[model samples]
Target: SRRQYQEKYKQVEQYMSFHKLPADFRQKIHDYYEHRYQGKMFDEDSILGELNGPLREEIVNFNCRKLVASMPLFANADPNFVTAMLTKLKFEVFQPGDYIIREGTIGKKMYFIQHGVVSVLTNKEMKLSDGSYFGEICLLTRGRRTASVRADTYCRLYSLSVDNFNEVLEEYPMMRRAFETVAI
Candidate 1:
């Protein structure tokens, strides 16, 4: 077993040089590469998909233990609801200064923060730090975003799409109540 990333690294360097890309852009690509792959390379979807339904369910919840522990809703909620929510969550990242959500835009997902800070640019300006969440109002109301949000730092988060949110909340009615309590 060797560093598989080195192989991919060489391939990326070859492509970068072959394309005659800008030096700064090449460096930017390297940063994205590291942040995304982080020294491990695996077909997570294919691997997990190969497992049976029950195994996949348990593993997903196991991997989300940190988020489960960090979120008050998850912590105090029904175990089945927690697993359902965690199963549907998608991990995402953003750079500082990135506009995560634009005002007046129709939002199709809500984000839960795992790390970093974000600025809520609305009638009330405030910061959403680690363990907080945003973008839920639009999902609940089926309306446009009331505010724009931008990343204040490198933000790592898990997003639940509107479809997933609706499906899971429907299964666990009180879960919607949990979100309502945190919405405002």
Candidate 2:
């Protein structure tokens, strides 16, 4: 675990020298690596991603239990819906003060905050922390992003692509109703 990240970072340092990157930007890169792989890393793809279909979905469902438990949209919904959504989610990380979503842009994704906090602009002001999801309104309305989202701290998020988001809901129209509870 430790060996891999160290080795991986060693390669990054070598790679950076080739590009002659700026020092401070390089600092951001180094900081990103540690925050992302500071400890070992989760190679869940090997164990979880390699599983058979039925097995994989159930495993993912359990892994995302924290998100399901925290989100009211998931809490009051059907298990199949929860599992389906989990399958479509992609994990992402954001640096402090980074913009996760921009106002008035064409957005095709929404996110669930797995950790940290983000500030929402275009309103008076708002803050979202773990267990919260945002950016779904664009998909629901088929419009541009109505708000901007910036990380107030390093954030771990699971993003759902618009295509996949609709695919899941197309099968379970009732899920749209639950999503609307949050969408509006």
Candidate 3:
């Protein structure tokens, strides 16, 4: 597996060099791959699908154990509600200074911070630490990002897409209000 990851990255490096991509961009891509894949690559969806529903759910829950425990929204929610939401989450990592959300761009998802800090760029600087979330305003209103969110430190986040957001909230209308309350 390590070899496979190495080979894949080698090819990526070759591709970058072949295309004459700038050094800074290459470095960012390299860093992103390392953090995003953690030195291994596999078809995660296929592997998860191979397991039974109970096991799949359990694995996802365990993988996001800290995230679930930290977010107040999931901390006390019904187990079914929690499971439903967790299944749709996509784990992402961002380097410090990366723009996680750009103001004026159409928002398609919201992110929950599992680690590190993010600064919400509005009229004033607003720092959000672990267990906090943002970008819900746009998802709720089907509007542009109200403010940019930039990573202040290397950030590990779980994102829920708009489709999945509405899907889970549709089944749990009350939870939708919870997000709207925060968005407001």
Name the 10 consecutive residues with the lowest summed lDDT in model 3: 67-76
Off by over 4 Å in 2: 41-49
Please give the distance, in angstroms, between residue 37's alpha carbon in candidate 1 and its true position after superposition.
1.7
The TM-score between candidate 3 and the true structure equals 0.94
Please, what's the RMSD in Å of model 1? Answer: 2.3
Runs in model 3 lying further than 4 Å from the true structure: none
Q: Number of the top candidate by TM-score?
A: 3
| lDDT agreement with native, every candidate | 0.85, 0.87, 0.90
Candidate with more favorable, higher lDDT: 1 or 3: 3
Clashing pairs in 2: none
lDDT of 2 by residue, 1-184 (tens): 7777777788999899899999998899998987877756667778776779999987788878787888877766778878888999998889998999999999999999888999999949899998889999998988999999989999989999999999998989877876687766
**Could you tell me every candidate's TM-score relative to the true structure?**
0.87, 0.89, 0.94
Q: Which scores higher on lDDT, 1 or 2?
A: 2
Enumerate clash totals for all models, in the order shown. Answer: 0, 0, 0
Please give the ranking of all candidate structures by TM-score, highest first, separated by commas.
Answer: 3, 2, 1
Deviation from native of the Cα of residue 139 in model 2, angstroms:
0.9
What CA RMSD would you report for each candidate? 2.3, 1.9, 1.3
- Judged by whole-model lDDT over C-alpha atoms, candidate 3 comes out at 0.90
- The CA lDDT at 176 in model 1 is 87
Native-vs-model 1 lDDT? 0.85
